[PDB]
Design an enzyme around this catalytic site. Structure first.
Site, PDB file in Angstrom:
ATOM      1  CD  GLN A 131      -2.230   2.122   1.485  1.00  0.00           C
ATOM      2  OE1 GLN A 131      -1.226   2.594   2.009  1.00  0.00           O
ATOM      3  NE2 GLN A 131      -3.333   2.831   1.287  1.00  0.00           N
ATOM      4  CD  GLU A 170      -6.858  -4.009   1.459  1.00  0.00           C
ATOM      5  OE1 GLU A 170      -7.973  -3.676   1.910  1.00  0.00           O
ATOM      6  OE2 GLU A 170      -5.779  -3.672   1.988  1.00  0.00           O
ATOM      7  N   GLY A 220       2.881  -6.124   6.048  1.00  0.00           N
ATOM      8  CA  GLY A 220       3.013  -7.529   5.729  1.00  0.00           C
ATOM      9  C   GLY A 220       3.522  -7.745   4.320  1.00  0.00           C
ATOM     10  CB  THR A 221       2.242  -6.611   1.035  1.00  0.00           C
ATOM     11  OG1 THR A 221       1.944  -5.296   1.516  1.00  0.00           O
ATOM     12  CG2 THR A 221       0.974  -7.415   1.036  1.00  0.00           C
ATOM     13  CB  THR A 258       0.247   3.371  11.947  1.00  0.00           C
ATOM     14  OG1 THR A 258      -1.156   3.222  11.703  1.00  0.00           O
ATOM     15  CG2 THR A 258       1.021   2.410  11.061  1.00  0.00           C
ATOM     16  CG  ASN A 312       6.148   7.266   7.466  1.00  0.00           C
ATOM     17  OD1 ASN A 312       5.944   6.061   7.587  1.00  0.00           O
ATOM     18  ND2 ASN A 312       6.148   7.876   6.289  1.00  0.00           N
ATOM     19  CG  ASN A 359       3.406   8.930  -0.601  1.00  0.00           C
ATOM     20  OD1 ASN A 359       3.951   8.904   0.500  1.00  0.00           O
ATOM     21  ND2 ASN A 359       2.448   8.083  -0.942  1.00  0.00           N
ATOM     22  CD  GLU A 414      30.207   6.547 -11.420  1.00  0.00           C
ATOM     23  OE1 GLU A 414      31.115   6.708 -10.581  1.00  0.00           O
ATOM     24  OE2 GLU A 414      30.415   6.316 -12.624  1.00  0.00           O
TER      25      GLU A 414
HETATM   26  N1  LIG Z   1       5.478   7.508   3.081  1.00  0.00           N
HETATM   27  C1  LIG Z   1       4.358   6.799   3.120  1.00  0.00           C
HETATM   28  N2  LIG Z   1       4.231   5.769   4.025  1.00  0.00           N
HETATM   29  C2  LIG Z   1       3.094   5.039   4.075  1.00  0.00           C
HETATM   30  C3  LIG Z   1       2.047   5.321   3.218  1.00  0.00           C
HETATM   31  N3  LIG Z   1       1.051   4.452   3.483  1.00  0.00           N
HETATM   32  C4  LIG Z   1       1.445   3.626   4.478  1.00  0.00           C
HETATM   33  N4  LIG Z   1       2.701   3.993   4.867  1.00  0.00           N
HETATM   34  C5  LIG Z   1       3.522   3.352   5.905  1.00  0.00           C
HETATM   35  O1  LIG Z   1       3.442   1.947   5.782  1.00  0.00           O
HETATM   36  C6  LIG Z   1       3.642   1.338   7.045  1.00  0.00           C
HETATM   37  C7  LIG Z   1       2.541   0.353   7.406  1.00  0.00           C
HETATM   38  O2  LIG Z   1       2.615  -0.770   6.563  1.00  0.00           O
HETATM   39  P1  LIG Z   1       1.804  -0.777   5.176  1.00  0.00           P
HETATM   40  O3  LIG Z   1       2.603  -0.171   4.052  1.00  0.00           O
HETATM   41  O4  LIG Z   1       0.476  -0.084   5.342  1.00  0.00           O
HETATM   42  O5  LIG Z   1       1.571  -2.339   4.914  1.00  0.00           O
HETATM   43  P2  LIG Z   1       1.253  -2.852   3.434  1.00  0.00           P
HETATM   44  O6  LIG Z   1       2.338  -2.512   2.448  1.00  0.00           O
HETATM   45  O7  LIG Z   1      -0.092  -2.319   3.033  1.00  0.00           O
HETATM   46  O8  LIG Z   1       1.083  -4.427   3.608  1.00  0.00           O
HETATM   47  P3  LIG Z   1      -0.349  -4.915   4.111  1.00  0.00           P
HETATM   48  O9  LIG Z   1      -0.983  -3.760   4.832  1.00  0.00           O
HETATM   49  O10 LIG Z   1      -0.181  -6.071   5.060  1.00  0.00           O
HETATM   50  O11 LIG Z   1      -1.153  -5.341   2.915  1.00  0.00           O
HETATM   51  C8  LIG Z   1       3.759   2.483   8.033  1.00  0.00           C
HETATM   52  O12 LIG Z   1       5.115   2.805   8.210  1.00  0.00           O
HETATM   53  C9  LIG Z   1       3.030   3.591   7.311  1.00  0.00           C
HETATM   54  O13 LIG Z   1       3.456   4.846   7.776  1.00  0.00           O
HETATM   55  C10 LIG Z   1       2.166   6.357   2.306  1.00  0.00           C
HETATM   56  O14 LIG Z   1       1.241   6.611   1.543  1.00  0.00           O
HETATM   57  N5  LIG Z   1       3.326   7.096   2.259  1.00  0.00           N
END
Ligand SMILES: Nc1nc2c(ncn2[C@@H]2O[C@H](COP(=O)(O)OP(=O)(O)OP(=O)(O)O)[C@@H](O)[C@H]2O)c(=O)[nH]1
Ligand SMILES: Nc1nc2c(ncn2[C@@H]2O[C@H](COP(=O)(O)OP(=O)(O)OP(=O)(O)O)[C@@H](O)[C@H]2O)c(=O)[nH]1
Ligand SMILES: Nc1nc2c(ncn2[C@@H]2O[C@H](COP(=O)(O)OP(=O)(O)O)[C@@H](O)[C@H]2O)c(=O)[nH]1
Ligand SMILES: Nc1nc2c(ncn2[C@@H]2O[C@H](COP(=O)(O)OP(=O)(O)O)[C@@H](O)[C@H]2O)c(=O)[nH]1
Lengths: 411, 50, 419, 426
Positions: free
Chosen positions: A10, A45, A118-119, A153, A180, A202, A228
């Site tokens: 995500q 997802e 997780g992913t 989070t 973050n 982002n 490099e």
């Molecule tokens: N910079 C940034 N960080 C994000 C964003 N969305 C989620 N995160 C970070 O992602 C982490 C939480 O894990 P996720 O990325 O949500 O997990 P995932 O990749 O969705 O894997 P699953 O939720 O299990 O399907 C935390 O550190 C959040 O702050 C985003 O849009 N930008």
């Protein structure tokens, strides 16, 4: 001269939603390195992927490139590594192969993931493993999001971060840390957005990525390719985790009043108040720095600025490296996004350095992970998913070895 | 108590910083002395060659 | 008759060589289209030395430099078959640029230079412009030097090489490249004219008083030096001195072939009409220590030999009293067991725009300072094996760096010995 | 052959030389672009004494402007004949001394003198046969007095065989601009007596007197004062530049006017200088030139020589003149006022003639009189110096910089024994 980019999870594909918006806007032969895009969004997802499918860029992306699973990883490294990853990862790499087949002069892959999920942790590590087997020699640029100390989070994110980094050592060749909480503080202090969302984060991450690949897309006075960073910034095979910073991250109101030049932005890129990782580089000793310059910059003042840095004493350098810099100058000015919160600048600087402050981050994470693990809290979820009790302790001892490595090299 | 421990530690760290600054002055001017003095050695060297 | 073949390696070498052919083609009056439009007939007589298509071979590992070559003017004058050109890129890795990527580009660059060498009758020598910090420039160019000497052992060879300095330091692996490059240069090149960006930036600060000296002007200064050194072949003079005669007059011992260079006259735009052009005035700018193009102050040691190539309608008598005065005045700065340490030469054709120019080539013993200045940085990094695995995992082992160290160490010892 | 290099120090020095190079270049018929446009060849044969041919009729003045403030140099280059100086000779600091002789002699001197010396060395070795050096500065300021005086000291250690002129204005009580004038004047004079060859004392008080009475100017700015000073200075060194019936070079004039090695502070005058109202009502004969020369009210210092005795005197005449009339007129003014002249030297006046008058005039003159009345000035300044030092006013701005109390006792002692020995020879 082409580089393909995969986006996991995500967080990865939301970052990608900013990256590709910037790329297509920037290119309106130089576009050949990116352009259909050379990307694969992949996630377990389908809700965030179908946001791309129904968005404005419905026609830009080839339909198959958007990979989407059927069920989530439930914020479990084990679930996203052994249960559900096993079905999606094969389809992902079967696509990366013929995208690389279409390419001819592939520089490398670059991956976007967050290690707390997780992913991003599970199948992100799994994908990197099989890519190392298939290619090996090609550079893999890993831009990870480690969890912050105080801003969080999730709850079990220590488990995922340790379990992801254990493979992140020997798979990625270049690894850039981005927390973050640090970027929240950056957007509050310099960009004066009191209420930031993920979109702003982002957006400026994409600005950093574009600045270090602009040497390929456009000719500069002193070009610096993807190989490099591989050489000039990694003194030892197990130390590859790089602080990142960018300047000037300035709002429209302030930028016009300020006189932007190379010396002051080279300074601004070295203060801890403008880095993408909440860490204190004063606590550490620098090993090697890399300076990306974009816009109206002549080689004189970049050399003059680097001389002033080396003679200052609030920041100290390592004894094994007297010439600890790798500069790079490119002609093209940084582009802007309508709606973006950054103003146009004549010249920008992206710093990618390596120090021992990162060695402090891993100890801080190890303590939180250690506390929960001793009384086996939350362990039974991962064990049911297919893992065991052994790999938690063995991943713990792997981070312990890394802590010793940083304390010894800095000596 | 901690609010005042912090003030004593800050004082100690500044006492070191003004010391570090003074040390750089010693480093710099001593380098200058080497350049002028080695010129003196060359002049005496030139005198004896002649 | 006497022929000079050009070879440009690496990004640094290509942009220097691009500016070089601009200046020479201008002097010979050939347009950027490739046709003659000059005035004097003295230029047509000795244009075979460099040509009308130039006799050059560009070589590198990244398309950006080639694209930037054909984009600018005088980019349509190179023969597209001479753009021998790899595709992957070494990238500041001497092992990659000397063993991995060189091993498949070197066969093709050798074929084109061999065809360009046998195309003429009697070679005078080759002329290589490259760096000592980068990988695809230094390493590949270095291997080319070694291959050429095996095929053409009786021909001269020039290497305009820039060296890294700690004040002007581009990359982090600079000493790892400079030490190894010198290890091959000391046994392969006939003579080398050492350059560096620190002295070049210093020249453009004080003498040129330029505000923003981009790479165009630095490459312009190095180009004026290379045009001045071969003027004796291309134009008649009252006392001729080709390349071979400078080498035998300057090198007393077979390992002492690293020269420092200067150029005169160099004046700011403001002071351009407020100045005179006389032989004594040019000599005071020649022997100035802040006019050498290396970061090695020659007044910290002795001179072994020195030469001055003059261009313009001059009186040879003036040449002799100026050279003898500089030798009798500062007798301690010159070596004692060689009398009259100065070689001179005159050519009647000045560069376009000036009435009277000069080129200085000094073989001093102050060079051992910069080489020790390099071995220090190399010594510390090598001791803990920093950055070593990016070279070792390619074929290089530890004894190679020790061997380059020994060659670095015994060279500065014999400079001290002859001092 | 014989060569003179020019050195201008401080703000006052820069403007004096600027009007000087305008007047001389005018005399040689060179236009502000720097090209020759003269008519006869009397002008061309002796431009090597001051200028150097650059390229195709380009003549550059052999001058070096040296100071510490950007504005002062910029002003000379904005105005005309500013575009003729070579930019290398603009030796120039950045911080500033500001009326502090200690800062001008110990603090900022130590890092600028080497650079200006390099220019002076290059300018000295650019010629063949040195005749001497020419320095213009003040004695009240800090960046001109202290820095310029240390420049004098460095030269005497480098070239002790060559001549040296210093045109120095002195501060007066009636014309007193700054507050640290005595602490600067005493130490400057102290260094002048041990380093300078001969000094030609000037002062702003006498300059104001001349511009009211004789010149009758309405708004006499510094441009016109410098116009007077430049015409006088050109009159001294006319003999090296032009041929005459009786040549008197600088070293010849020095040995004729200096009876004792420490007695080298000269008073000056110039003739003719008339208003445009009375210019039409007089003639140009030797008597009119001599009476206006020897007038005490026409001297260019605020020290009335009629309050003492003339030791020696010299007169340099310009124009087509008869040497018979020269010495008879000089002899007449020496016989009448015999009491004002020293007794044990007959014919105390050396005289010389040059055959080229300045542009616009048929006949001029320049007076250089080594009198004994200069002891009044040193007393008039030394008492102010002693008045401050007794209770240490302003002392700490020098003491905290590197001088001690013994340096002031030394400076007062040398002035005291100098005034005592002038009084002795009186
Ligand atoms: N910079 C940034 N960080 C994000 C964003 N969305 C989620 N995160 C970070 O992602 C982490 C939480 O894990 P996720 O990325 O949500 O997990 P995932 O990749 O969705 O894997 P699953 O939720 O299990 O399907 C935390 O550190 C959040 O702050 C985003 O849009 N930008
Ligand atoms: N009869 C006559 N005597 C002259 C003339 N010019 C100069 N003198 C005399 O020369 C004497 C001084 O000697 P000069 O010839 O002028 O000078 P000098 O002999 O060369 O000695 P220096 O001045 O040191 O060069 C004076 O007493 C004059 O009387 C002249 O044109 N006619
Ligand atoms: N004088 C000059 N030096 C250059 C130029 N371009 C690069 N350099 C120098 O070359 C060094 C880097 O060499 P590089 O071009 O990367 O070599 P390569 O990678 O092997 O082709 C830097 O230290 C620069 O100072 C140029 O145009 N002129
Ligand atoms: N005759 C003349 N005197 C000047 C001029 N400018 C300044 N002065 C005098 O110089 C004195 C002050 O000296 P100053 O300029 O401060 O010297 P500096 O700062 O050391 O260079 C004042 O008493 C003025 O009378 C000028 O143009 N002509």
């Amino acid at each position: 001269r082409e580089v393909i980019s995969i986006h996991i999870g995500q967080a990865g594909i939301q970052v990608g939603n900013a990256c590709w918006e910037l790329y297509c806007l920037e290119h309106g032969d130089a576009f050949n390195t990116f352009f259909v895009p050379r990307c694969i969004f992949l996630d377990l997802e389908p809700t965030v992927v179908d946001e791309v499918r129904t968005g404005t860029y419905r026609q830009l992306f080839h339909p198959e490139q958007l990979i989407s699973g059927k069920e989530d990883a439930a914020n479990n490294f084990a679930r996203g590594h052994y249960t559900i990853g096993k079905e999606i990862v094969d389809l992902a790499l079967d696509r990366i192969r013929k995208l690389a087949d279409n390419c001819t002069g592939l520089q490398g892959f670059l991956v976007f993931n967050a290690v707390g999920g997780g992913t991003g942790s599970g199948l992100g590590s799994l994908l990197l493993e099989r890519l190392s087997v298939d290619y090996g020699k090609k550079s893999k640029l890993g831009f990870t999001v480690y969890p912050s100390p105080q801003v969080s989070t999730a709850v079990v994110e220590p488990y995922n971060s340790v379990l992801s980094t254990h493979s992140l050592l020997e798979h990625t060749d270049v690894a850039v840390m981005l927390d973050n909480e640090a970027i929240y503080d950056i957007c509050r202090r310099s960009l004066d957005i009191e209420r930031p969302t993920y979109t702003n984060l982002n957006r400026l991450i994409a600005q950093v990525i574009s600045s270090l690949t602009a040497s390929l897309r456009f000719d500069g006075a002193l070009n610096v390719d993807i190989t490099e960073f591989q050489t000039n910034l990694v003194p030892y095979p197990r130390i590859h985790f790089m602080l990142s910073s960018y300047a000037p991250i300035i709002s429209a109101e302030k930028a016009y009043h300020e006189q932007l030049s190379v010396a002051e932005i080279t300074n601004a890129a070295f203060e801890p108040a403008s880095m993408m990782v909440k860490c204190d580089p004063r606590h550490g000793k620098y090993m090697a720095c890399c300076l990306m310059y974009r816009g109206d910059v002549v080689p004189k003042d970049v050399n003059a600025s680097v001389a002033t840095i080396k003679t200052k004493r609030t920041i100290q350098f390592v004894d094994w490296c007297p010439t600890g810099f790798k500069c790079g100058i490119n002609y093209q000015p940084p582009t802007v996004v309508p709606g973006g919160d950054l103003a146009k600048v004549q010249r920008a600087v992206c710093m990618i350095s390596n120090s021992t402050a990162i060695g402090e981050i891993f100890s801080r994470l190890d303590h939180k992970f250690d506390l929960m693990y001793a009384k086996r809290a939350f362990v039974h979820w991962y064990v049911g998913e297919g893992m065991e009790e052994g790999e938690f302790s063995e991943a713990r001892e792997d981070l312990a070895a890394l802590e010793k490595d940083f304390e010894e090299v800095g000596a | 108590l901690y609010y005042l421990l912090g003030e004593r530690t800050r004082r100690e760290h500044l006492a070191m910083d003004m010391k570090v600054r003074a040390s750089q002055q010693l480093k710099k001017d001593s380098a200058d002395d080497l350049y002028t003095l080695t010129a003196h050695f060359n002049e005496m060297r030139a005198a004896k060659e002649q | 008759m006497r022929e000079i073949v050009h070879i440009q390696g690496g990004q640094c070498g290509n942009q220097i060589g691009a500016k070089f052919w601009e200046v020479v083609s201008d002097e010979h009056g050939i347009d950027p289209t490739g046709t003659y439009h000059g005035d004097s007939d003295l230029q047509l007589e000795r244009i075979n030395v460099y040509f009308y298509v130039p006799r050059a071979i560009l070589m590198d590992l990244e398309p950006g430099t080639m694209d930037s070559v054909r984009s600018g003017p005088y980019g349509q004058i190179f023969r597209p078959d001479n753009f021998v050109f790899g595709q992957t890129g070494a990238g500041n890795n001497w092992a990659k640029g000397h063993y991995t990527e060189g091993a498949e580009l070197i066969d093709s660059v050798l074929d084109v230079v061999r065809k360009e060498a046998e195309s003429c009758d009697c070679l005078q020598g080759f002329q290589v412009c490259h760096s000592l910090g980068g990988g695809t420039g230094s390493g590949m160019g270095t291997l080319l030097i070694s291959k050429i000497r095996e095929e053409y052992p009786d021909r001269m060879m020039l290497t305009f090489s820039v060296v890294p300095s700690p004040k002007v330091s581009d990359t982090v692996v600079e000493p790892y490249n400079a030490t190894l490059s010198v290890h091959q240069l000391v046994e392969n090149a006939d003579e080398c004219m050492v350059l560096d960006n620190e002295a070049l930036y210093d020249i453009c600060f004080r003498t040129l008083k330029l505000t923003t000296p981009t790479f165009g002007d630095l490459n312009h200064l190095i180009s004026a030096v290379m045009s001045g050194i071969t003027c004796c072949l291309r134009f008649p003079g009252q006392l001729n001195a080709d390349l071979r005669k400078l080498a035998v007059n300057l090198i007393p011992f077979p390992r002492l072939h690293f020269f420092m260079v200067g150029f005169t006259p160099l004046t700011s735009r403001g002071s351009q009409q407020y100045r005179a052009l006389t032989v004594p005035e040019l000599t005071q700018q020649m022997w100035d220590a802040k006019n050498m193009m290396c970061a090695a102050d020659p007044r910290h040691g002795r001179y072994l030999t020195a030469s001055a190539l003059f261009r313009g309608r001059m009186s040879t008598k003036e040449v002799d009293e100026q050279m003898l005065n500089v030798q009798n005045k500062n007798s301690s700065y010159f070596v004692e067991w060689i009398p009259n340490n100065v070689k001179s030469s005159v050519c009647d054709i000045p560069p376009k725009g000036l009435k009277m120019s000069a080129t200085f080539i000094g073989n001093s013993t102050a060079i051992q300072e910069m080489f020790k200045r390099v071995s220090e940085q190399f010594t510390a990094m090598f001791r803990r094996k920093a950055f070593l695995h990016w070279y070792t995992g390619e074929g290089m082992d530890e004894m190679e760096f020790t061997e380059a160290e020994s060659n670095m160490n015994d060279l500065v010892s014999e400079y001290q010995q002859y001092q």
